[PDB]
């Protein structure tokens with residue numbers, strides 16, 4: 001055959017369809033994981049500055065990162081992590097969080113390695129693991145209005161997934177799609193098993209600043225003994241509400257990072273210069289206002305908490321049952337009552353109910369959500385088929401349009 | 414061990430010690446493959462427009478490319494290639510030419526496949542082949558002031574490199590580092606063998622617009638039968654003198670391109686939105702002014718041809734022997750007369766003479782060039798140890814500074 005066998009089984013990607021259904025019909029798109037309002041002024045101005053400043057910013061910068069950006073990443077996150085971070089040895093700038101993940105898997109995962117993934121998971125973890133020759137091993141959070149915090153990571157289950165073949169565990173907190181914010185106890189559980197079995201924790205923290213109800217983001221790399229076995233990933237797009245900038249980073253110790261640098265230099269070599277300058281300027285702004293009321297990292301999550309609360313109240317009007325998230329852009333609603341009363345929606349054989357339900361909801365109610373079964377291993381999709389994911393990081397006008405659709409549903413319902 | 418075996422042997426980067434040595438001395442940097450003058454106003458303006466326009470340009474665009482960009486790529490290059498190009502199936506936007514190359518190797522090259530590489534080669538072709546499990550197979554152009562045109566691709570030698578395991582051949586024209594522009598006859602030779610053995614031609618055309626002395630860029634995908642077995646790669650950075658934008662593309666038939674799409678959706682998923690908009694607007698400008706005196710693609714090569722001629726004359730004053738390039742940012746000079754008169758330069762074991770010479774030249778003469786042995790397979794570096802690469806796409810002030818260094822050259826010797 002023409003194509004490499006590393007591509008086996010990872011050519012199906014359901015997002016192309018999801019994005020297609022999302023725009024053409026007179027619909028309210030609560031499926032897209034990006035804001036439909038502008039980034040903050042200081043961020044847009046930072047990018048404007050980068051493309052209207054030193055003309056040499058139009059040319060290549062340093063391979064492992066624009067130095068003003070690695071400098072402030074190392075400064076600011078070293079403070080948050082309680083860690084001294086070397087910008088040249090412990091920081092790599094990437095093409096988004098997505099590229100950061102890809103770089104980590106290609107650096108570390110080899111044929112026959114096991115990778116522990118926690119369900120529900122951001123869907124790329126599985127095919128990225130597979131492309132690198134890894135064997136995904138799944139542990140399912142146990143469902144306990146419900147709260148994301150009560151979805152339990154069972155210690156005996158998680159412990160039994162660790163083997164001599166375990167290379168890495170992928171921890172996503174705050175979690176997409178569930179909105180769970182991992183507690184110190186849960187991180188200590190993961191940390192102890194990673195230390196016991198000599199496993200690297202790849203930790204996806206792109207939603208770090210999106211935490212609600214006084215819950216604290218805790219980075220596992222800040223725990224005792226974890227810096228030397230953790231990679232910590234962030235995203236400028238989720239941090240500054242500018243998802244189209246596609247700038248990300250990995251933080252971690254040199255002995256691991258050198259292998260991500262090897263992947264980087266043999267794949268993209270440089271990231272764009274001017275978006276990196278914009279991101280550096282943006283972090284410098286937030287660092288100087290850190291913990292103050294006028295800082296974006298205080299204002300924004302407080303705003304989005306109000307949007308979350310609005311959506312939670314509104315979706316209940318139609319009998320959807322939200323699970324209250326403690327963080328992220330997202331919440332999920334249980335649709336088990338609809339599956340019970342309306343089981344026979346059209347769909348393919350072995351098509352999970354939530355995919356069928358979303359198609360029905362888009363066409364007939366004018367609302368877009370994402371079926372949560374895409375965030376499960378295929379064998380578990382039949383058992384976790386009754387949730388859908390909504391995004392509440394939306395303009396007030398959009399949430400008003402959501403309420404118009406919901407009011408029309410209710411009278412029908 | 415911790416890291417994946419695919420990284421074996423590809424962490425060494427020979428550029429680093431020269432750029433490190435470069436920054437320490439008061440030097441004229443003719444090693445940098447980028448302009449030290451601004452991109453053209455219309456290109457810089459286009460990026461300014463994109464970051465100060467529709468605020469939704471700050472959010473994600475479509476996975477396989479910003480649609481106004483894939484539209485103009487497909488229109489503009491379809492005409493040049495004599496091919497109907499569909500934006501959705503035949504175009505992929507990538508993170509530079511680098512990212513495009515990476516995507517092609519990861520899609521097509523598998524354990525045990527052979528990949529034919531033409532020496533001197535842009536240096537990533539080898540480690541990218543290796544990381545995808547392929548086996549590089551090398552064919553050397555034979556050196557014929559000399560002209561890059563006289564470096565011959567021997568028909569018998571080339572034909573003998575093809576085997577049942579040949580997956581692809583990598584064609585770079587115009588060539589970095591040599592500046593050779595492949596003739597129709599040379600491309601018909603490569604096409605004939607690729608059709609005979611069923612081999613994909615990966616064709617790196619990033620220097621397409623940089624052609625001199627009446628020489629024409631010919632795209633191999635335009636030859637009979639070749640569109641269905643060719644991938645054509647371009648770079649906005651080499652096209653609009655904006656290397657820090659890091660936007661590239663691949664063009665090709667769906668039956669191959671679908672596999673690059675699979676790699677893309679499992680590695681970066683999106684390219685940045687606003688640089689893509691800038692590139693699209695820049696191409697629209699050139700399309701409207703195609704073949705007209707005020708067009709960049711007319712003006713810029715003519716201007717850089719004068720810079721080339723200036724550099725050729727200047728470097729000769731010191732006993733360097735230039736080979737006149739027909740295209741690209743680069744020219745090479747033979748340093749054989751220096752190896753005869755000064756054979757015993759300091760260096761490590763088996764360190765090729767040209768690498769030692771460049772270090773000597775940086776430290777004693779204040780000029781930076783790149784040793785051409787980095788563009789050769791290791792077994793061939795001893796034979797091909799007497800060329801260095803200069804970049805003449807430079808500000809008039811940089812060329813003045815070069816001439817000042819050349820005046821001060823003889824005093825030592």
Ligand SMILES: Cc1ncc(COP(=O)(O)O)c(CNOCC(=O)O)c1O
Nearest residue numbers: 032033096097098122176206235237248
């Ligand atoms: C957990 C997680 N990690 C990483 C990423 C990627 O971040 P970036 O945009 O920086 O590449 C994302 C982006 N999510 O957007 C897709 C969705 O609607 O589910 C993410 O959610």
Ligand SMILES: Cc1ncc(COP(=O)(O)O)c(CNOCC(=O)O)c1O
Nearest residue numbers: 446509510511535589617619648650661
């Ligand atoms: C042949 C070739 N292909 C691809 C690329 C990559 O293009 P991009 O910047 O678009 O990723 C380059 C960039 N070369 O600059 C490095 C050097 O001085 O040798 C290139 O020369």
